[PDB]
């Protein structure tokens, strides 16, 4: 049952970025949060890529897959 989330997640991010280099790095950001498991790291990179409000959805976009506990803490770290 867990598969479309990837398409909707990748399709959404692509709808916002529409770029490749950006998605590559953003894809790298997620890969990092997976290995290092450091929410503080995701926020940093996500910013460098989401420096503009236009890429705001990335926060709410990634949250879903982001651990329920980390989701809240993710909110505590983010001002929005």
């Amino acid at each position: 049952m867990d598969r479309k989330v990837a398409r909707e997640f990748r399709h959404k991010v692509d709808f916002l970025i529409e770029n490749d280099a950006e998605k590559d790095y953003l894809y790298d950001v997620l890969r990092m949060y997976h290995q290092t498991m450091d929410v503080a790291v995701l926020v940093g990179d996500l910013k460098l890529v989401i420096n503009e409000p236009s890429r705001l959805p990335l926060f709410d976009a990634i949250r879903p897959l982001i651990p329920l506990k980390h989701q809240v803490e993710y909110d505590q770290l983010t001002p929005r």
Partner: peptide, 18 residues
């Protein structure tokens, strides 16, 4: 819904190799 969707999308890209 935790520690499952991440690998789904993460690995999905790992397969795409884009």
């Amino acid at each position: 819904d935790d520690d499952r969707y991440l690998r789904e999308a993460i690995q999905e890209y790992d397969n795409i190799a884009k």
